[PDB]
């Protein structure tokens, strides 16, 4: 169970904090698991998705496609993946939103800030 008088277990408060989270908090919520090859190499379970990471979709009707991430769209809590699109009435292609928890990161964009993050975990 939970034994911490400073932490609430209220459904109403939990949902309010989720949908009213600022941009920095929404970054941490929007995280995805790493692949087995990346897990053994870095000893890290999951990190937040950057714009330029390459992922593979695991759940949904696009559950086998893969490609570079093109937009981490924090306001709707969704990820836009390259070539994972959908056609409007006019025939133009628009991206579909994929929740970060439905994908697995197969390749990281390593930068010295991310490299520091991986060392911390």
């Amino acid at each position: 169970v939970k034994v911490n008088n400073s932490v609430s277990s209220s459904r109403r408060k939990a949902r309010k904090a989720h949908f009213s989270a600022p941009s920095s908090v929404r970054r941490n919520i929007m995280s995805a698991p790493l692949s087995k090859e990346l897990r053994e190499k870095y000893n890290v379970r999951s990190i937040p998705i950057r714009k330029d990471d390459e992922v593979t979709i695991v759940r949904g009707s696009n559950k086998d496609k893969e490609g570079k991430v093109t937009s981490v769209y924090r306001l709707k809590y969704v990820i836009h993946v390259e070539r994972v699109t959908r056609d409007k009435a006019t025939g133009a292609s628009v991206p579909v939103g994929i929740h970060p928890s439905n994908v697995v990161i197969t390749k990281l964009k390593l930068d010295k800030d991310r490299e520091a993050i991986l060392e911390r975990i």
Binding site: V1, S9, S10, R11
Partner: protein, 258 residues
């Protein structure tokens, strides 16, 4: 409810002569709430009948001595196989109902993996598995407030706080339905949940030693006597003492029609 609810307005009755009910009505002329009724339980934005107060008797004072009488009865009912089964526990493979496990086995049950294995070995596995597989979603507005699930009660592990130690309870928390209790507390709400007797209790060896000392330390409470000495009516009625004085049956179970 708030004590101001339904009374944050200055409505006054219009009286007779206007072809409307004599109930107080809002004033003004620029809103939908122009001549709407304000005070009263029948109105749309009025107050409830007899608004609830915090003065209500929430807590009940039960005599210490009826609490102890019931706790002893709950412990006694925990020692009967029919009352365990009639409650709904899976005790089909338990050797003896007062299931007492040697306190030396609880040495390394501070880990949930070991604690679960111990309950399976002693014959409490079926009851433990039943509680886990019964998690449902409750019906009603309980889910809205805080109560989301209902998952049945399993065995109750009873130990000694001074000999067994406090590390036992660490390994018994995540197991659904399994709850612990020191031998010197014995909450009745855990011994007869819902008012139904026959909780399945798993004692430690040390807790059995101290059960006599616990009920002899309680001052002002002696173990109660019973209104009937022999609680088995079959031997009482079919005794040679009773049957020898009966003046023969005057009829039969089913009477011949006149």
């Amino acid at each position: 409810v708030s004590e101001k609810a339904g009374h944050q307005t200055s409505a006054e009755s219009w009286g007779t002569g206007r072809a409307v009910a004599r109930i107080p009505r809002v004033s003004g002329g620029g809103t939908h709430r122009a001549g709407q009724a304000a005070f009263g339980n029948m109105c749309r934005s009025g107050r409830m009948f007899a608004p609830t107060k915090i003065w209500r008797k929430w807590h009940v004072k039960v005599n210490q001595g009826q609490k102890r009488f019931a706790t002893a009865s709950a412990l006694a009912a925990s020692a009967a196989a029919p009352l365990l089964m009639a409650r709904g526990h899976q005790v089909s493979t338990v050797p003896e109902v007062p299931l007492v496990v040697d306190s030396a086995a609880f040495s390394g049950v501070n880990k949930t993996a070991n604690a679960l294995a111990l309950l399976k070995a002693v014959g409490a596995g079926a009851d433990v598995q039943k509680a886990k597989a019964s998690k449902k979603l409750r019906a009603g507005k309980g889910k809205l407030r805080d109560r989301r699930h209902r998952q049945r009660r399993g065995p109750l592990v009873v130990y000694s706080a001074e000999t067994d130690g406090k590390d036992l309870i660490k390994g018994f928390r995540n197991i659904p339905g399994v709850e612990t209790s020191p031998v010197d507390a014995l909450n009745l709400l855990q011994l007869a949940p819902g008012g139904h007797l026959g909780r399945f209790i798993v004692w430690t060896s040390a807790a059995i030693k101290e059960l006599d000392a616990v009920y002899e330390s309680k001052k002002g409470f002696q173990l109660p006597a019973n209104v009937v000495a022999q609680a088995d009516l079959t031997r009482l009625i079919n005794s040679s003492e009773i049957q020898s004085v009966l003046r023969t049956p005057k009829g039969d179970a089913k009477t011949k029609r006149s």
